[PDB]
Amino acid sequence: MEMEKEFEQIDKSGSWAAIYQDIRHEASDFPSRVAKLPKNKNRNRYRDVSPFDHSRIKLHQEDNDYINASLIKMEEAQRSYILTQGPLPNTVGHFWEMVWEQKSRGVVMLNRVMEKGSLKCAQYWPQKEEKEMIFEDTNLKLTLISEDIKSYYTVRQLELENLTTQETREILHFHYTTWPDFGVPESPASFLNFLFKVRESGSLSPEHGPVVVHCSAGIGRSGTFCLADTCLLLMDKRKDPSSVDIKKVLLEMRKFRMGLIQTADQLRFSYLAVIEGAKFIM
Numbered sequence: 001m002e003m004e005k006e007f008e009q010i011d012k013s014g015s016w017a018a019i020y021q022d023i024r025h026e027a028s029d030f031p032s033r034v035a036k037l038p039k040n041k042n043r044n045r046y047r048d049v050s051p052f053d054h055s056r057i058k059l060h061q062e063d064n065d066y067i068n069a070s071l072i073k074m075e076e077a078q079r080s081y082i083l084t085q086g087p088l089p090n091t092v093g094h095f096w097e098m099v100w101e102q103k104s105r106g107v108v109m110l111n112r113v114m115e116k117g118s119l120k121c122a123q124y125w126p127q128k129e130e131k132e133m134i135f136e137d138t139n140l141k142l143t144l145i146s147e148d149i150k151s152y153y154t155v156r157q158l159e160l161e162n163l164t165t166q167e168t169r170e171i172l173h174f175h176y177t178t179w180p181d182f183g184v185p186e187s188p189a190s191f192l193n194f195l196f197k198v199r200e201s202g203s204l205s206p207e208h209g210p211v212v213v214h215c216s217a218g219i220g221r222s223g224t225f226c227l228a229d230t231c232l233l234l235m236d237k238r239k240d241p242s243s244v245d246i247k248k249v250l251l252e253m254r255k256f257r258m259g260l261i262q263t264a265d266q267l268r269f270s271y272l273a274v275i276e277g278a279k280f281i282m
Protein backbone atom coordinates (compact mmCIF):
# COMPACT_ATOMS: atom_id res chain seq x y z
CA MET A 1 0.00 0.00 0.00
CA GLU A 2 1.48 3.40 -1.14
CA MET A 3 2.58 4.94 2.21
CA GLU A 4 1.09 8.42 1.23
CA LYS A 5 -2.43 6.83 1.24
CA GLU A 6 -1.68 4.82 4.43
CA PHE A 7 -0.62 8.29 5.83
CA GLU A 8 -3.90 10.12 4.90
CA GLN A 9 -5.93 7.06 6.19
CA ILE A 10 -4.15 7.16 9.64
CA ASP A 11 -4.44 11.05 9.83
CA LYS A 12 -8.18 11.18 8.91
CA SER A 13 -8.80 8.32 11.44
CA GLY A 14 -6.44 9.85 14.11
CA SER A 15 -4.93 6.36 14.81
CA TRP A 16 -1.18 7.34 15.18
CA ALA A 17 -1.20 6.23 18.89
CA ALA A 18 -2.73 2.83 17.91
CA ILE A 19 -0.19 2.14 15.05
CA TYR A 20 2.71 3.14 17.39
CA GLN A 21 1.58 0.84 20.25
CA ASP A 22 1.30 -2.10 17.71
CA ILE A 23 5.04 -1.54 16.86
CA ARG A 24 5.95 -1.39 20.61
CA HIS A 25 4.09 -4.74 21.11
CA GLU A 26 5.74 -6.59 18.11
CA ALA A 27 9.32 -5.21 18.75
CA SER A 28 12.20 -7.61 19.55
CA ASP A 29 13.30 -8.33 23.16
CA PHE A 30 16.93 -9.59 23.42
CA PRO A 31 19.18 -9.70 26.53
CA SER A 32 21.31 -6.63 27.60
CA ARG A 33 23.26 -8.44 30.42
CA VAL A 34 26.60 -6.56 29.91
CA ALA A 35 24.81 -3.09 30.11
CA LYS A 36 23.32 -4.08 33.54
CA LEU A 37 26.61 -5.22 35.25
CA PRO A 38 27.28 -3.07 38.38
CA LYS A 39 30.75 -2.00 37.02
CA ASN A 40 28.90 -0.27 34.07
CA LYS A 41 26.34 1.83 36.04
CA ASN A 42 28.19 5.16 35.44
CA ARG A 43 28.56 4.32 31.64
CA ASN A 44 24.73 4.52 31.08
CA ARG A 45 22.75 7.78 30.87
CA TYR A 46 19.21 6.20 31.20
CA ARG A 47 18.42 3.06 33.24
CA ASP A 48 15.75 1.98 30.62
CA VAL A 49 17.93 2.43 27.39
CA SER A 50 20.57 -0.29 26.92
CA PRO A 51 22.35 -1.95 23.93
CA PHE A 52 21.47 -5.65 23.27
CA ASP A 53 24.42 -7.98 23.90
CA HIS A 54 24.31 -9.44 20.33
CA SER A 55 24.71 -6.03 18.52
CA ARG A 56 26.69 -3.92 21.10
CA ILE A 57 29.95 -2.18 20.01
CA LYS A 58 32.99 -3.52 21.94
CA LEU A 59 35.88 -1.19 22.92
CA HIS A 60 39.34 -2.74 22.01
CA GLN A 61 40.57 -2.96 25.65
CA GLU A 62 40.97 -5.83 28.17
CA ASP A 63 39.97 -3.71 31.26
CA ASN A 64 36.29 -2.99 30.34
CA ASP A 65 35.01 -3.21 26.70
CA TYR A 66 31.57 -1.61 27.46
CA ILE A 67 29.99 1.46 25.74
CA ASN A 68 26.25 2.25 25.37
CA ALA A 69 26.27 1.86 21.51
CA SER A 70 24.71 -0.56 18.95
CA LEU A 71 25.52 -1.60 15.33
CA ILE A 72 22.39 -1.35 13.11
CA LYS A 73 23.23 -3.47 9.95
CA MET A 74 20.64 -3.08 7.09
CA GLU A 75 21.34 -6.05 4.75
CA GLU A 76 19.12 -5.15 1.74
CA ALA A 77 19.90 -1.39 1.84
CA GLN A 78 23.72 -2.10 2.29
CA ARG A 79 23.97 0.62 5.03
CA SER A 80 25.33 0.34 8.61
CA TYR A 81 24.91 2.88 11.48
CA ILE A 82 26.23 3.03 15.05
CA LEU A 83 23.53 4.51 17.36
CA THR A 84 24.83 5.72 20.78
CA GLN A 85 23.73 7.89 23.78
CA GLY A 86 25.05 11.43 24.21
CA PRO A 87 28.49 11.04 25.86
CA LEU A 88 28.71 11.43 29.71
CA PRO A 89 31.59 13.07 31.69
CA ASN A 90 33.06 9.57 32.34
CA THR A 91 32.60 8.29 28.69
CA VAL A 92 33.90 11.11 26.36
CA GLY A 93 37.24 9.21 26.04
CA HIS A 94 35.40 5.91 25.29
CA PHE A 95 33.25 7.74 22.64
CA TRP A 96 36.32 8.92 20.65
CA GLU A 97 38.05 5.49 21.15
CA MET A 98 34.96 3.95 19.41
CA VAL A 99 35.09 6.47 16.49
CA TRP A 100 38.86 5.65 16.06
CA GLU A 101 38.48 1.82 16.33
CA GLN A 102 35.38 1.59 14.02
CA LYS A 103 37.01 3.83 11.28
CA SER A 104 34.04 6.22 11.22
CA ARG A 105 34.31 9.36 8.99
CA GLY A 106 31.22 11.18 10.40
CA VAL A 107 29.46 11.93 13.75
CA VAL A 108 25.79 13.04 13.50
CA MET A 109 24.48 15.04 16.56
CA LEU A 110 20.70 15.75 16.70
CA ASN A 111 20.46 17.55 20.12
CA ARG A 112 21.83 20.68 21.85
CA VAL A 113 24.17 20.25 24.85
CA MET A 114 21.48 22.03 26.97
CA GLU A 115 17.70 21.57 26.23
CA LYS A 116 14.71 22.29 28.59
CA GLY A 117 17.30 23.93 30.98
CA SER A 118 19.11 20.57 31.66
CA LEU A 119 22.33 19.00 30.32
CA LYS A 120 21.56 16.41 27.54
CA CYS A 121 25.24 15.45 26.84
CA ALA A 122 28.84 16.45 27.69
CA GLN A 123 30.66 19.20 25.72
CA TYR A 124 32.72 16.47 23.97
CA TRP A 125 34.40 18.50 21.11
CA PRO A 126 36.62 21.66 21.24
CA GLN A 127 35.00 25.07 20.61
CA LYS A 128 38.23 27.00 19.70
CA GLU A 129 41.08 26.06 17.31
CA GLU A 130 43.84 26.93 19.83
CA LYS A 131 42.24 24.97 22.77
CA GLU A 132 42.49 21.27 21.79
CA MET A 133 41.18 18.37 23.99
CA ILE A 134 43.32 15.44 25.27
CA PHE A 135 41.57 12.24 26.55
CA GLU A 136 44.21 10.72 28.91
CA ASP A 137 42.24 7.49 29.64
CA THR A 138 42.17 6.48 25.86
CA ASN A 139 45.33 8.40 24.64
CA LEU A 140 43.60 10.58 21.95
CA LYS A 141 43.92 14.27 20.95
CA LEU A 142 41.05 16.16 19.27
CA THR A 143 41.50 19.58 17.49
CA LEU A 144 38.92 21.90 15.94
CA ILE A 145 40.09 22.60 12.30
CA SER A 146 37.13 24.68 10.94
CA GLU A 147 33.44 25.42 11.65
CA ASP A 148 30.62 26.34 9.12
CA ILE A 149 27.49 27.71 10.95
CA LYS A 150 24.24 27.68 8.89
CA SER A 151 20.64 28.49 9.85
CA TYR A 152 19.49 24.86 10.52
CA TYR A 153 22.86 23.01 11.07
CA THR A 154 26.62 23.47 11.78
CA VAL A 155 29.40 21.34 10.14
CA ARG A 156 32.79 21.03 11.87
CA GLN A 157 36.08 19.60 10.59
CA LEU A 158 37.94 17.84 13.49
CA GLU A 159 41.40 16.19 13.64
CA LEU A 160 41.60 13.01 15.76
CA GLU A 161 45.14 11.84 16.69
CA ASN A 162 45.98 8.42 18.15
CA LEU A 163 48.80 9.57 20.55
CA THR A 164 50.07 5.92 20.73
CA THR A 165 50.98 5.78 16.92
CA GLN A 166 50.80 9.51 15.87
CA GLU A 167 48.33 8.59 13.09
CA THR A 168 45.69 11.32 12.43
CA ARG A 169 42.27 11.27 10.68
CA GLU A 170 39.79 13.93 9.59
CA ILE A 171 36.34 13.49 11.33
CA LEU A 172 33.28 15.49 10.12
CA HIS A 173 30.81 16.66 12.85
CA PHE A 174 27.24 17.20 11.51
CA HIS A 175 25.21 19.11 14.12
CA TYR A 176 21.46 19.59 13.57
CA THR A 177 20.85 22.54 15.97
CA THR A 178 17.10 23.37 15.45
CA TRP A 179 15.08 20.27 16.59
CA PRO A 180 12.49 21.85 18.99
CA ASP A 181 12.65 21.29 22.79
CA PHE A 182 9.04 19.83 22.57
CA GLY A 183 7.45 17.79 19.72
CA VAL A 184 8.81 17.42 16.12
CA PRO A 185 9.51 19.95 13.30
CA GLU A 186 6.39 21.23 11.44
CA SER A 187 8.05 20.60 7.99
CA PRO A 188 10.69 17.90 7.23
CA ALA A 189 12.39 20.18 4.63
CA SER A 190 15.34 21.24 6.87
CA PHE A 191 15.88 17.66 8.29
CA LEU A 192 15.98 16.21 4.68
CA ASN A 193 18.39 19.01 3.55
CA PHE A 194 20.62 17.98 6.52
CA LEU A 195 20.40 14.20 5.64
CA PHE A 196 21.47 15.09 2.03
CA LYS A 197 24.49 17.09 3.41
CA VAL A 198 25.67 14.06 5.45
CA ARG A 199 25.25 11.78 2.37
CA GLU A 200 27.22 14.23 0.11
CA SER A 201 30.17 14.16 2.60
CA GLY A 202 30.92 10.39 2.10
CA SER A 203 30.19 9.73 5.83
CA LEU A 204 27.45 7.10 5.01
CA SER A 205 29.39 5.35 2.23
CA PRO A 206 30.91 1.83 2.36
CA GLU A 207 34.53 3.03 1.97
CA HIS A 208 34.31 4.23 5.66
CA GLY A 209 33.33 2.62 8.99
CA PRO A 210 29.70 3.19 10.08
CA VAL A 211 28.52 6.76 10.82
CA VAL A 212 28.09 7.40 14.61
CA VAL A 213 24.63 8.90 15.31
CA HIS A 214 23.43 10.25 18.70
CA CYS A 215 20.85 12.40 20.48
CA SER A 216 20.46 12.27 24.32
CA ALA A 217 19.33 8.57 24.55
CA GLY A 218 20.26 7.58 20.91
CA ILE A 219 16.83 6.04 20.09
CA GLY A 220 14.31 8.79 19.15
CA ARG A 221 15.69 11.57 16.86
CA SER A 222 18.56 9.10 16.04
CA GLY A 223 15.93 6.51 15.02
CA THR A 224 14.23 9.03 12.70
CA PHE A 225 17.53 9.82 10.91
CA CYS A 226 18.46 6.13 10.12
CA LEU A 227 14.82 5.12 9.31
CA ALA A 228 14.38 7.93 6.75
CA ASP A 229 17.84 7.29 5.14
CA THR A 230 17.26 3.49 4.75
CA CYS A 231 13.63 3.85 3.43
CA LEU A 232 14.74 6.39 0.72
CA LEU A 233 17.72 4.13 -0.33
CA LEU A 234 15.32 1.11 -0.66
CA MET A 235 12.92 3.21 -2.82
CA ASP A 236 15.96 3.93 -5.18
CA LYS A 237 17.07 0.25 -5.36
CA ARG A 238 13.74 -1.68 -5.85
CA LYS A 239 11.60 -2.12 -9.06
CA ASP A 240 8.40 -1.08 -7.13
CA PRO A 241 9.19 1.82 -4.73
CA SER A 242 5.57 1.46 -3.40
CA SER A 243 6.62 -1.96 -1.80
CA VAL A 244 8.74 -0.11 0.89
CA ASP A 245 6.93 -0.67 4.24
CA ILE A 246 8.18 1.89 6.80
CA LYS A 247 6.69 -0.11 9.78
CA LYS A 248 8.51 -3.30 8.63
CA VAL A 249 11.86 -1.41 8.16
CA LEU A 250 11.48 0.06 11.72
CA LEU A 251 10.83 -3.42 13.19
CA GLU A 252 13.97 -4.76 11.39
CA MET A 253 16.02 -1.85 12.90
CA ARG A 254 14.56 -2.64 16.43
CA LYS A 255 16.19 -6.12 16.16
CA PHE A 256 19.53 -4.19 16.73
CA ARG A 257 18.62 -1.42 19.28
CA MET A 258 15.55 -1.08 21.56
CA GLY A 259 13.07 1.81 21.47
CA LEU A 260 13.91 3.42 18.04
CA ILE A 261 11.20 6.14 17.45
CA GLN A 262 10.08 7.22 20.99
CA THR A 263 6.61 8.80 20.27
CA ALA A 264 3.65 8.56 17.83
CA ASP A 265 4.58 12.14 16.65
CA GLN A 266 8.16 10.92 15.74
CA LEU A 267 6.53 8.02 13.75
CA ARG A 268 4.26 10.49 11.83
CA PHE A 269 7.28 12.82 11.20
CA SER A 270 9.30 9.81 9.79
CA TYR A 271 6.42 9.07 7.31
CA LEU A 272 6.27 12.77 6.29
CA ALA A 273 10.08 12.89 5.77
CA VAL A 274 10.11 9.75 3.53
CA ILE A 275 7.01 10.88 1.51
CA GLU A 276 8.52 14.38 0.86
CA GLY A 277 12.07 13.01 0.26
CA ALA A 278 10.78 10.43 -2.31
CA LYS A 279 9.02 13.13 -4.43
CA PHE A 280 12.17 15.38 -4.29
CA ILE A 281 14.20 12.46 -5.86
CA MET A 282 11.42 10.61 -7.86
Ligand SMILES: CN1C[C@@H]2CN3C(=O)CCN3[C@@H]2c2ccccc21
Pocket: 089, 092, 122, 123, 124, 132, 133, 134, 135
Ligand atom coordinates in the same frame (compact mmCIF):
# COMPACT_ATOMS: atom_id res chain seq x y z
C1 LIG B 1 40.98 18.24 27.66
N1 LIG B 1 39.85 18.12 28.59
C2 LIG B 1 38.59 17.66 28.01
C3 LIG B 1 38.02 16.44 28.74
C4 LIG B 1 36.55 16.22 28.41
N2 LIG B 1 35.85 16.41 29.62
C5 LIG B 1 34.47 16.69 29.78
O1 LIG B 1 33.67 16.74 28.80
C6 LIG B 1 34.24 16.87 31.19
C7 LIG B 1 35.70 17.21 31.72
N3 LIG B 1 36.60 16.41 30.83
C8 LIG B 1 38.07 16.63 30.33
C9 LIG B 1 39.00 17.75 30.83
C10 LIG B 1 39.02 18.09 32.20
C11 LIG B 1 39.87 19.11 32.70
C12 LIG B 1 40.71 19.81 31.81
C13 LIG B 1 40.70 19.48 30.45
C14 LIG B 1 39.85 18.45 29.96
